[PDB]
Amino acid sequence: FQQMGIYAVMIEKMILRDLCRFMFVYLVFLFGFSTAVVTLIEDSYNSLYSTCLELFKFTIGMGDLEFTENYDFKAVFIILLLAYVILTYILLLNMLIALMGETVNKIAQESKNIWK
Amino acid sequence: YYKGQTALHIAIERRNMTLVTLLVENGADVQAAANGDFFKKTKGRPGFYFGELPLSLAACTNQLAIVKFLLQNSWQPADISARDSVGNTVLHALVEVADNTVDNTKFVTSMYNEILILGAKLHPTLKLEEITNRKGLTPLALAASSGKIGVLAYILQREIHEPECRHLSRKFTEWAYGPVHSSLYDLSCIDTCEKNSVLEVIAYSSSETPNRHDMLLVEPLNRLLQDKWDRFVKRIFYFNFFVYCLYMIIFTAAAYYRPVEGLPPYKLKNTVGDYFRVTGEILSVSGGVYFFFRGIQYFLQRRPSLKSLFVDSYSEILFFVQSLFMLVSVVLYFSQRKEYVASMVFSLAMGWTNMLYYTRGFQQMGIYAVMIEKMILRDLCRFMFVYLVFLFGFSTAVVTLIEDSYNSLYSTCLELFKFTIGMGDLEFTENYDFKAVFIILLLAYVILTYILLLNMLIALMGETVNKIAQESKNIWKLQRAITILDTEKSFLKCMRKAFRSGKLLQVGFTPDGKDDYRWCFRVDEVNWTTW
Amino acid sequence: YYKGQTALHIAIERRNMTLVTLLVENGADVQAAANGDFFKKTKGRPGFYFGELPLSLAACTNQLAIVKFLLQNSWQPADI
Numbered sequence A: 001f002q003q004m005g006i007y008a009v010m011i012e013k014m015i016l017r018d019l020c021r022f023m024f025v026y027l028v029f030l031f032g033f034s035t036a037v038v039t040l041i042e043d044s045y046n047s048l049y050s051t052c053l054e055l056f057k058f059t060i061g062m063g064d065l066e067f068t069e070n071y072d073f074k075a076v077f078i079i080l081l082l083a084y085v086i087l088t089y090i091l092l093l094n095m096l097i098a099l100m101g102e103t104v105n106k107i108a109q110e111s112k113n114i115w116k
Numbered sequence B: 001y002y003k004g005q006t007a008l009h010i011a012i013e014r015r016n017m018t019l020v021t022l023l024v025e026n027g028a029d030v031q032a033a034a035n036g037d038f039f040k041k042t043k044g045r046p047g048f049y050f051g052e053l054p055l056s057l058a059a060c061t062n063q064l065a066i067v068k069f070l071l072q073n074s075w076q077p078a079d080i081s082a083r084d085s086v087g088n089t090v091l092h093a094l095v096e097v098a099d100n101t102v103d104n105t106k107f108v109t110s111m112y113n114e115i116l117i118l119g120a121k122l123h124p125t126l127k128l129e130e131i132t133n134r135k136g137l138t139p140l141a142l143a144a145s146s147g148k149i150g151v152l153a154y155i156l157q158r159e160i161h162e163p164e165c166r167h168l169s170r171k172f173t174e175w176a177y178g179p180v181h182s183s184l185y186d187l188s189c190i191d192t193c194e195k196n197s198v199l200e201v202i203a204y205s206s207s208e209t210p211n212r213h214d215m216l217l218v219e220p221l222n223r224l225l226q227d228k229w230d231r232f233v234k235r236i237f238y239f240n241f242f243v244y245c246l247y248m249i250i251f252t253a254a255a256y257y258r259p260v261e262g263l264p265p266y267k268l269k270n271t272v273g274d275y276f277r278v279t280g281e282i283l284s285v286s287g288g289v290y291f292f293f294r295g296i297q298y299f300l301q302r303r304p305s306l307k308s309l310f311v312d313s314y315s316e317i318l319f320f321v322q323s324l325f326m327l328v329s330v331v332l333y334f335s336q337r338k339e340y341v342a343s344m345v346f347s348l349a350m351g352w353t354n355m356l357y358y359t360r361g362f363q364q365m366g367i368y369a370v371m372i373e374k375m376i377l378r379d380l381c382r383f384m385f386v387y388l389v390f391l392f393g394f395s396t397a398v399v400t401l402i403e404d405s406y407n408s409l410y411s412t413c414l415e416l417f418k419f420t421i422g423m424g425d426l427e428f429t430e431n432y433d434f435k436a437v438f439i440i441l442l443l444a445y446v447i448l449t450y451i452l453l454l455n456m457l458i459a460l461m462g463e464t465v466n467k468i469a470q471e472s473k474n475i476w477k478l479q480r481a482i483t484i485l486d487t488e489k490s491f492l493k494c495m496r497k498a499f500r501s502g503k504l505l506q507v508g509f510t511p512d513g514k515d516d517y518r519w520c521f522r523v524d525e526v527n528w529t530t531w
Numbered sequence C: 001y002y003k004g005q006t007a008l009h010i011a012i013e014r015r016n017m018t019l020v021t022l023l024v025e026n027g028a029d030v031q032a033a034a035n036g037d038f039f040k041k042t043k044g045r046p047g048f049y050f051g052e053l054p055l056s057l058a059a060c061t062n063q064l065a066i067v068k069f070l071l072q073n074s075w076q077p078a079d080i
């Protein structure tokens, strides 16, 4: 199916390229701020797994910004979360769309040849 | 202003060969040290540089006849190697007058080549382009340091087809079969002049040079950097990356298992876990101070001053700031305070986000990392001014209105922030009257910010991506270049593997009877030109 | 490296048909099985592949006269 075959090939190429380029950066930022936050908040989460999850949730639009109160240094904790949200949800996710836009402009013609 | 003028400079300024000839025939002086402020350096005031020499004056004016005549007078000839009050000669003036336009580039190319050849034939025994000014710069070093890319491109690829006169040129041919041509580029003064090489003055430029990014694309440099990369630097850089990753893992582990008792320092226990932990803390602090001293070494060796720290060397600054946070953590640790964790935490966060520094070396990733750097500089200032303005406006309006639990500029700033990450409520309180006003404010805020401004951000990042497609490759090549130079420069083991394809002979015979060695670099090409 | 050389490929490399004519008239052999490492495949090292036949050199070099002459010698013609 020509019109759909091209689209499927574009998906294949963008999965190979941009979800290595993106995911290295994203996992680096996420792991960094996860380890920072879980280092800080130590009295129910208190766990690198649960904090990695809760910081993941800011990317799908369900972060809380007050997912615990069991800590001191509340200014530090908020600064970490705001820095994470700004660097990841606002910047990097939108840069992803911009770069996929440019790469789509690049592989307009390559895809037809790949499909053939 | 027109100080130290002479009629020779007037005639040459007027492009009158006859007046020049008469003035020489009338016994005019050669060493016209015209230091006129109108004809001095510092072109901020209107003026045109001559540098206290009629040869420079004729050459910058594209007057070949005057130049040759001055070099071949009967009454008194001119010596090209005469230097002005700054120490500049004709070549430094030739460099200065270029601006990398096409016709100016061709003019300076022609004039430079001819002047140099004439200097050689008049005094084959004496050198010219090795002569340095008070700052110690050759014409090559000068043209590099100021982004005179055209004349730099010329100088790096001088080739002469004339007997007994190839000694000036520097791009040679070892052999040339039908399609196969194997050239040799001289790398003298490229890796080291003992003061400042070409690469040093390019990569460590002051960032105001308008085209420093592209200067590394000129053929012998790019070939050279890539060769050095594959030779030994790639392994050292990957090793450094691996060591840094181990350091970050150790730091993460040592921090995560910190004890939760009061008031450090915490005395150790006999369990082996505490030995692992305290060794981890020691290694972490050691790494922190190590980066501190590398930062200081950068600052002392390069001495940037108040300008490049805003536009350049973000990586060195950020690694230094990590070191500062670690040190503050050590201080607060041993001052019997709990707050040390705050400092440690910040360091740890930066300790991971600086991992992106090591993306250079991986082409497809390095370009992406550079694009992130450029967007964080540009669009998250342009955006955040507007966004903070709207947010603060509607926050103060709403908190002004709703006053009976929030009743607070902080919590309302958060609640209005949440509309940007997709968790606003639209009914986050009911403690007010004027419900229509409150809803109108929130709907206006949501429309202006969540609907419009974020989507402006996406569109503009799109356009900037379209713009910086090519700039990023040049920036990345520069970052790899500065990495190579810094790795070579120290290396902490007293080895010099920077040398080129042997001390190859230039000709084995200069105009003088002695031989000559070049330190050439080979480049093989196969092409259907020259047929 | 330059194993199995004959002057025919020197003349042809130099694009001098006259020397080729002389060498053929002097009874130079055609099937010059030069296995020189300079003339093998894999041009990553400097080299120019023609494959153990001077006719290949002449054709590879855009020399129509040499190839026709080699194919139409009196002493010994070339076989493609």
Ligand SMILES: CCCCCCCCCCCCC(=O)O[C@@H](COC(=O)CCC)COP(=O)(O)O[C@@H]1[C@H](O)[C@H](O)[C@H](O)[C@@H](O)[C@@H]1O
Pocket (backbone or CB within 6 Å): A083, B311, B312, B313, B314, B315, B316, B318, B346, B349, B350, B353, B354, B356, B357, B372, B373, B376, B377, B475, B478, B479, B482
């Ligand atoms: C609150 C707690 C959390 C705070 C986290 C902050 C994370 C910052 C984001 C990650 C930084 C990654 C990095 O490593 O920094 C990036 C630059 O990003 C930034 O500046 C962000 C500033 C803000 C690499 O840029 P780099 O310094 O290598 O290149 C320089 C220079 O070296 C070149 O010679 C010359 O061409 C210059 O034009 C330029 O190219």
